[PDB]
Design a protein around this ligand. Structure first.
Ligand SMILES: [Cl-]
Ligand SMILES: [Cl-]
Ligand SMILES: [Cl-]
Ligand SMILES: [Cl-]
Ligand SMILES: [Cl-]
Ligand SMILES: [Cl-]
Ligand SMILES: [Cl-]
Ligand SMILES: [Cl-]
Ligand SMILES: [Cl-]
Ligand SMILES: [Cl-]
Ligand SMILES: [Cl-]
Ligand SMILES: [Cl-]
Ligand SMILES: [Cl-]
Ligand SMILES: [Cl-]
Ligand SMILES: [Cl-]
Ligand SMILES: [Cl-]
Ligand SMILES: [Cl-]
Ligand SMILES: [Cl-]
Ligand SMILES: [Cl-]
Ligand SMILES: [Cl-]
Ligand SMILES: [Cl-]
Ligand SMILES: [Cl-]
Ligand SMILES: [Cl-]
Lengths: 494, 487, 490, 494
């Protein structure tokens, strides 16, 4: 049932105007993730009453109000509680057809931004501008140069922040050139490199789990931990738009960015404070100590057609080039060369067209050899980030009853069972943090370099045809070689 | 489903003191459950031996005895068949003629056995008043024993085991020539509770608890016993015992030994009992300065009368119905770790739990965090939960306290056995691990005797508290000052 | 003399200006260290050492030969180089407050820089400020105003000596007065303890070895003691001391540097800022010393009469309550050091000359009990630079029976090395642009924050100052306080 | 200079007569080790004034006084301080010719002992009789049966203790049969199985080093220790008497007994007390958790002639059978399957005809990866039991002086340079402890079984000709394959 939206905007966003410009408003990401997150933040009353959401793309628009009502509003989610606010929120959105390379079209955008900023009834003159760059990577530097050249606020009249989306190059060299191309354009402080995993409720809780608790603090090192596994599983393939993926692969898409962020949070030292800089300095520090993934210590897969025929093979896609050896699956063994993690194996898994949708972290502890031996098995801390948010500790306990034996049990915490809260999407958090000027859950220039350095030797070997890409039926668990590799790497299954 | 060892030879379970409140309320019901579980042989001989000159045994068995049996909605059809196994005998606890009469009957039952071995195993359950104990033991040893190489003889013995080190040592010396330690099964029913039996698994089958179980990670250990009930009617018995001798010396010291012991050499009985004795021998004797005592007064409204309002209770009695103690374990694992042992009657709730409180993680969260805590609740509802700090779910960067819970009533369909089912079974299976050993008993009395003597000399102050309240206010301040951080 | 000069010192001119050349510190510590670095071939042979002071001396050559050269040490090996080195020293009478005199200084440095036969046209300037604290900001303003080297023609580095204020407020003031004058990068705040061979080895002992690394936390360590003892009193310079006290003189600076190196976390690298960031970090977690957790002393005359009482000095004001002795219990509020007591000791007119670090480990209760006692890692920085670990071992022979033994390392026995003075290292490091063994602006603030509440309680007459005979071990109350604080002896 | 002997006999030995019977007095072990140790114990005033030393053997005597003066006294050591006491001590020794199998001669042995016991002027009647069995293993059970049958003291009139020398079988089965053959003859308490390593100053200090000190206690487990090495080196070969060695080998001679005792003391848990059975219970406990040595994880050698010709080859000995594959050298990798030692490699080395005489223990700790990396190396705890008794900890420190580099240093303790004490021979301690009834430094029946169980699968593989025995020149460091095996096993060289 429909209810009033509070004026709960952060006080640091009240005094001056607010213009959120979504560059690439026509794009799949903006319609599926950006505009829905803005709607939820508006409904939560976390954005000002008078925000200006400006869509800008090359798409010509015959009816912006039909696009807003039919296309945009279709992707909004809590419509049984917030369906009434759709109209009011959409009243805040405006659209603009413009190029990503022509200066006049960038003078147009700024003139509209000035026009909206002048409409403000609050105390301070000027305005704060947040730019969401949801564009194809071929136009990125074009937009950045254009925005920096003449879409910036006057000095001492409001902050200008830039939310930037992946891809961030294809390896160390291509990424480094993009970072150098952006260095004269904007300060590091104004760039907000999005990796949506850093906005997931269970990824945001890693740092608390680890450093607010002595139980995990005392155990979080090579003396107690035997193996660390990071898993990404998807039932969906890379169909329709599979030619886009052929150029990327599973390592560049999921492993380099998303699962390396989880790796940095799980392996970092305790931060000097909970400041952004202090947290990101520990993230860079550990990533700089990860030995580059080696081709011998990995397994790759590419999905074939499903047992029945429902899901077609990866190569059946017309966008996919003939005889492509692009991996849709990868399992890697990683080593962190420091005194906390010496000898602890890190198993990173990511695959498409698998048996289930999964995102979890598995901290498997050493066995307690005596006095139980075979009557016991490795404890494990499991943090499952999706489908259902849960954290559970797997242990051994006496079989309940008159029978004197052991069994495996769990000390569980299930978020759907424990809390009434309808959790926010990763993009709600991240967009909010960017408005609150909080950089901790945003990839730093050096944090990005450190990530590419782990995977580039491997990515290049793959691209040279040096690493074998094994087939697997869509809907199966992946190649059989992968489970043997996982076993041999150090992970004891349950 | 009987043990193959129990199949071969006759089995005679003799309950000495069958007319007593313990036998009817705890022994016979546990025997019924083992019989129903098919853990006892079908041709088992349960022989009640007491001073009661009762006329109608069949009426006693049907009306009195059967009334205390529990799963009658599931296994109450077997009442008749089980009761058909029970026989009764009037006899004295001091006359050889009455034990000769006992040996005579057990023999007439053993000879009736249709199995392979011509002898017969004897388990004696001594549920007697302590003034007749040595009398019975001498009588049973003199002429109620089984012939060599024709079946074992096992003696289950109930508390009290003296009142201090000297009186207990006396009793152990009186029993030494009568039976060998292996034959003696000293019952402490806490060692039969599902959560107490899981201590050893929790601690030594898991690296998570193993790594953390020492002074580097643990800040404080608390053992709690709470009862809403007072000395309701039978206050004259309690007056002579007190809360330390009743609960703390036996029950909570068993929990203390299992929580503080080193890792055993194996899961054998003596290897486990050797570690229990070892730690108890390193507990510094409780000091009168490091304790708080209470005696309950009438409840705020009047429902529960005061301890001294009981006519069985002598005038001006300074008997403690409540006690909180701080204990120190003088070894390298537990150096500096405070142990808080709590036991009281007429309190706010029924509770039996263990609290392992870990050190605070000072940085980087400071006030945004609080000590982790591993809580093991043995009753009212068998639970094990680990208290932690986590980010408040949602669109806010704050912290909150959460739990990684395991609740046995929610997780399992198993209707758990009574403490006496386990122990009686273990005694038939000849497993001594959950039975107080002669030296284990001495080590326990040595911790509390200096304190008990100080109390008995009128050296320790016994503070009043309203029945139904949390006890004296001095106790919570003592707990705080002892090392335990409240939430 | 070898050509062991660093290549950055070679291309450009080098001018080392010693401001306060007539001062006791200059003749006793600065000029002797410069001589050793010249002899070692660590300084260019065409170096310009310019003494700048208020002294109106007539004969510089006599001052250099008789006064200066008298304090030089290896003269059985380097006596022949005295002449050549002294030929590099020049002197210049001038004020610390007149711009014309600093202009005259700038004028001289430029004439010297123009005389250089090397490739570059500019010149590197190192200024050693060995001045009384009342003229400090005067000199800094004058030097910054017009004694600086042109842009892209050489670095300007400033070596600054203690006192750095008298508490947090006075120190903060001085740091703010210097902020617009020089970039922190150029400022080299000297604390000579960071140049001592045993203090320089703390970081290696601790983080290059798993034996000490595994043991360096509250689980294994029971007590940490830092000791400073001197047989010498004020002896002549009492009024000079009266205004400072033992805490401001030794404890706040010297022993807090040892405290930071002993308590810091493992650095991200061996870079200056990575090391100095861990030093600031721990100091920011030391709970401020409390007046209840300390013992103070002031020496009286020695049992016989040899050493007179502190108050017998005419420079010392009548009825002065200045402490010549202090023992303190300090707490470091972090997860590595929670519950570990830190006992910091410093006193004058005591039984012996000592500077050592004592890490006392927890007792192994069982199976030896009374047959054993706490292990101890002792690092003695002077009189005889050594490191030894105190342990329990079986009594050798047909007995059993335990005894206390040591696994020793004595530097004068094991090495033929004749170690450099603390000032040789640091002066060298300042020329090499290495800031790791120099007090950072924030590192200084963090140090004063520990002692200022206590220093103020002392200055308000709130803390009792107990007497002790010169040559004794100090007040008896101090030993009992040490015992009660957590330290056990035998 | 010559001085009076004190009456420093332990009070428990003062009360009743003492008869030390050396069975096999003509033997090389008695003349080289037993009688010299007795002389030192007599000189120390640790034996009664009126002891009776009775030599018993098969060897006919032509002049006992000449054997005593010329042969026996020749092996006595401190003759510049104790040369004057030689006469007085030798006056206590008597000799007896007799068999090791005929009862007739054991009745004579009992007859002489009672005669000596009756001569006692002290309080208590009867006598304490210590039997030192220095016999060839073919007569062992013969002697034990004879001594038990009728050379035992009357009940409640004095203890009868038996010192028994190696060999204790050749594997588990042969050892077990010998222990069962002795079970009805004597109680375990009365048997004192000698392993002379348990009498060495540095071996006796292991237990103190480890459990009286928190520095070593905290560090003594898999979290800090990377590798543990036990070394035995001898310059001597099997010169003249090779026939006896051929039947034994280096594993049965040194590794199974001597170095496994060092292994048990280095790996055991902390004892419940310093009582004999509390210490011996921990020794059995760890030995019962050592995985049996595997043929794949070992290197064997047999010495050839020295580079010059001084020391001849092992096979050049006529006592040595033709084409013998007996190992004079062995290096093994051992694993202790418990939570303290999981993953820690144990390297056990023993060889004859090597470069030097050595007996040392090396406890190599894990590297400290950061911040020093290559500027540092693994710390090590070295306990050298002979030639010179030193204990030293190897560490990294700053190079003294101006130079800001690192170097390797030591925190040393050398016993000849820190104590004035002329240390006793291993046999002085052990004989003394046997008189003082202290069993802690004597192999227990179960401790012996646990030792054989580690080496028997390997010994049998060797005896079946399944393990390769590599040659090495006498005086060299052994086969080159051994140093590569040591490296690969986990030990990082100096
Ligand atoms: Cl197809
Ligand atoms: Cl989901
Ligand atoms: Cl839950
Ligand atoms: Cl490459
Ligand atoms: Cl004790
Ligand atoms: Cl909750
Ligand atoms: Cl649950
Ligand atoms: Cl016992
Ligand atoms: Cl008492
Ligand atoms: Cl703080
Ligand atoms: Cl010195
Ligand atoms: Cl010494
Ligand atoms: Cl030395
Ligand atoms: Cl203040
Ligand atoms: Cl005679
Ligand atoms: Cl005997
Ligand atoms: Cl044997
Ligand atoms: Cl054992
Ligand atoms: Cl085992
Ligand atoms: Cl030697
Ligand atoms: Cl030495
Ligand atoms: Cl055993
Ligand atoms: Cl075999």
């Amino acid at each position: 049932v429909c209810e009033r939206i509070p004026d709960a905007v952060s006080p640091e966003l009240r005094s001056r105007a607010l213009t959120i410009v979504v560059l690439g408003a026509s794009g799949d990401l903006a319609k599926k993730k950006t505009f829905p997150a803005l709607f939820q933040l508006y409904c939560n009353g976390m954005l000002p009453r008078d925000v200006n959401i400006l869509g800008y793309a090359r798409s010509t628009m015959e009816d912006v109000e039909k696009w807003k009502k039919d296309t945009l509003a279709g992707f909004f989610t809590r419509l049984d509680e917030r369906g009434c606010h759709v109209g009011n929120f959409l009243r805040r959105i405006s659209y603009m057809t413009g190029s990503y390379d022509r200066d006049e079209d960038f003078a147009r955008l700024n003139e509209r931004i000035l026009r909206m900023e002048e409409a403000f009834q609050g105390p301070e003159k000027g305005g704060n501008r947040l730019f969401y760059l949801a564009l194809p990577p071929s136009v990125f530097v074009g937009v950045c140069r254009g925005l920096s050249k003449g879409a910036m606020q006057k000095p001492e009249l409001g902050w200008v922040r830039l939310i930037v989306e992946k891809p961030f190059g294809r390896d160390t060299e291509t990424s480094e050139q993009l970072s150098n191309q952006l260095k004269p354009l904007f300060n590091e402080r104004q760039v907000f490199r999005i990796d949506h995993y850093l906005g997931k409720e269970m990824v945001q809780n890693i740092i608390v789990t680890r450093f607010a608790n002595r139980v995990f603090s005392a155990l979080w090192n090579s003396n107690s931990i035997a193996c660390v596994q990071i898993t990404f599983k998807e039932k969906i393939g890379t169909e329709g738009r599979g030619g886009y993926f052929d150029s990327i692969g599973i390592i560049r898409d999921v492993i380099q960015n998303h699962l390396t962020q989880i790796l940095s949070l799980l392996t970092m030292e305790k931060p000097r404070s909970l400041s952004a800089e202090d947290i990101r300095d520990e993230k860079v520090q550990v990533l700089r100590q990860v030995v580059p993934a080696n081709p011998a210590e990995c397994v790759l897969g590419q999905y074939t057609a499903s047992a029945d025929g429902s899901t077609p093979g990866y190569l059946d896609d017309p966008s996919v080039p003939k005889g492509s050896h692009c991996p849709t699956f990868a399992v890697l063994r990683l080593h962190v060369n420091n005194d906390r993690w010496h000898g602890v194996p890190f198993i990173i898994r990511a695959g498409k067209a698998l048996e289930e949708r999964l995102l979890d972290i598995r901290i498997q502890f050493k066995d307690e050899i005596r006095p139980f031996g075979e009557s016991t098995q490795r404890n494990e801390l499991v943090i499952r980030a999706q489908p259902s948010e849960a954290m559970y500790l797997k242990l051994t306990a006496k079989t309940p009853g008159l029978l004197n034996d052991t069994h495996q049990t769990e000390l569980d915490l299930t978020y759907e069972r424990r809390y009434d809260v309808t959790l926010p999407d990763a993009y709600e958090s991240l967009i909010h943090e960017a408005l609150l000027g909080n950089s901790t859950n945003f990839v730093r220039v050096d944090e990005l370099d450190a990530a590419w350095r782990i995977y580039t030797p491997l990515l290049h070997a793959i691209d040279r045809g040096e690493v074998k890409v094994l087939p697997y039926a869509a809907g199966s668990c992946g190649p059989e070689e992968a489970q043997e590799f996982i076993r041999i790497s150090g992970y004891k299954t349950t």
